[PDB]
């Protein structure tokens, strides 16, 4: 049961303050440093900065976020901590601490060894101006333009909400072969959108009711959407 | 600053094959000093290797790390299905900040599959929000790469969509991917043809899925 336990997810406005905690379990806090790494969307990892923790605990922190980063250890509640001040939408990232023996201690068998090799469970942080809101649900109707022979496309426009996620299903879950939910979009707005489809047969169109039905918890908003052929 | 560099790029390779990684850096490291991870969308890293050849414990022997100086190789001798993921170099230390490599994804190949593609204009509902939104549908395709254009009455559009793709299917290997163009709803009244084309090495030229806004 060694492991490194974090803090939940927030959403914080930009220009605040956020504290990120982990707390380790499982074996000697101060044998070991700990790192904070993080990873934006669409970004590969950067770290960010360590704790000397057995070593006095300073931190050193990486160039970028130098200025408005603080980290500190607790020893006696084994705890270590990331704060990051003036909180920007290029923030926006899921947060991690890990530990590393980082050169510092001889290791049985080991040495003075480097890895990362305990990781946290990670912490989101939602940098944003957005207040919650749920989402906007639009059909994706099956017409000419979505009939692919014998095959017809559908879907759902789950537009406008916040913060993440939405779930989707179709058709209370009977509906599974075939459907496709991407990813959400952030948009300039700072509203999250995203799109669910599915492909049926085109004969289908006029005999099976499609239903999509979507739940987005932050904000108590539970949406169900008939998708129908375009009338003509 | 060191500089970690990755090849390839992306694999794309078959469960039970052999794969190989490269990670290249721009000055000579200690073997103390290079590592590996796994990385899987969602999911905290996973160390596989440490001092440039080292397991950690639990880690499958299947993974193993050599090198030196400069030139570094991450090799999994029989693919598994869990083992397609982001592998990450990385110099680990014992100086800082720490830099991870820029990541080699390792995909499950698959024979070449062209986009079926389906375009969505907005919903009467919609457009009584003010805003219109079109959607270009590229359905189960292969490989991940595919260019989308948009253009509104002949007019290449700029800066107004936004693409989403998902991960691979776990039955088909495939991709699919959705472009979104939002548009004012006067801007959408004011124009006609609204047209999605469609590049992937799938298709022997690219294909251009339209409507014309008020027909049936």
């Known amino acids: 049961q060694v492991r490194l336990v974090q803090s939940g997810g927030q959403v914080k406005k930009p220009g605040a303050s956020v504290t990120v905690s982990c707390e380790a379990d499982?074996?000697?806090?101060?044998?070991?440093?700990i790192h904070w790494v993080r990873q934006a969307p669409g970004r590969g990892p950067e770290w960010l900065g360590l704790?000397?923790?057995?070593?006095?605990?300073?931190?050193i922190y990486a160039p970028n976020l130098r200025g408005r980063v603080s980290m500190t250890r607790d020893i006696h509640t084994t705890t270590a901590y990331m704060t990051l001040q003036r909180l920007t939408l290029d923030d926006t990232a899921t947060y991690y601490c890990?530990?590393?023996?980082?050169?510092?201690?001889?290791?049985?068998?080991?040495?003075?060894?480097?890895?990362?090799?305990?990781w946290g469970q990670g912490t989101t942080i939602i940098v944003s101006s957005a207040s919650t809101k749920g989402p906007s649900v639009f059909p994706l109707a099956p017409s000419s333009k979505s009939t692919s022979g014998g095959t017809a496309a559908l879907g759902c426009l789950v537009k406008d909400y916040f913060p993440e996620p939405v779930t989707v299903s179709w058709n209370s879950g009977a509906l599974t072969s075939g459907v496709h939910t991407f990813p959400a979009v952030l948009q300039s707005s700072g509203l999250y959108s995203l799109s669910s489809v599915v492909t049926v047969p085109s004969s289908s169109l006029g005999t099976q009711t499609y239903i999509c039905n979507v739940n987005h918890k932050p904000s108590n908003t539970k949406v169900d959407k008939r998708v129908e052929p375009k009338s003509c | 600053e060191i500089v970690l560099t990755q090849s390839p790029g992306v694999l794309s390779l078959s469960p039970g094959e052999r794969a190989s990684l490269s990670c290249r850096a721009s000055?000579?490291?200690?073997?103390?000093?290079l590592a590996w991870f796994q990385h899987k969308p969602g999911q905290p890293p996973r160390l596989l290797i440490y001092?440039?050849?080292s397991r950690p414990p639990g880690i499958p022997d299947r993974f193993r790390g050599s090198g030196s100086g400069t030139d570094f190789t991450l090799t999994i001798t029989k693919l598994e299905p869990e083992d397609f993921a982001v592998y990450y170099c990385?110099?680990?230390?014992?100086?800082?900040?720490?830099?991870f490599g820029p990541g080699t994804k390792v995909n499950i190949k698959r024979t070449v599959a062209a986009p079926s593609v389906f375009i969505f204009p907005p919903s009467d509902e919609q457009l009584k929000s003010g805003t219109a939104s079109v959607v270009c549908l590229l359905n189960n395709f292969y490989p991940r790469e595919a260019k989308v254009q948009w253009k509104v009455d002949n007019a290449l559009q700029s800066g107004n969509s936004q693409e989403s793709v998902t991960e691979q299917d776990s039955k088909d290997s495939t991709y699919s991917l959705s472009s979104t163009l939002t548009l004012s709803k006067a801007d959408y009244e004011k124009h006609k043809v609204y047209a999605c084309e469609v590049t992937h090495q799938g298709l022997s030229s690219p294909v251009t899925k339209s409507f014309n806004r008020g027909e049936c």
């Open positions: 890990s530990r590393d023996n980082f050169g510092t201690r001889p290791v049985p068998g080991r040495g003075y060894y480097y890895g990362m090799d305990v």
């Open positions: 499982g074996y000697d806090f101060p044998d070991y440093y």
């Open positions: 704790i000397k923790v057995g070593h006095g605990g300073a931190a």
């Open positions: 000055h000579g490291l200690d073997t103390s000093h």
């Open positions: 001092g440039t050849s």
């Open positions: 990385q110099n680990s230390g014992g100086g800082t900040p720490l830099i």
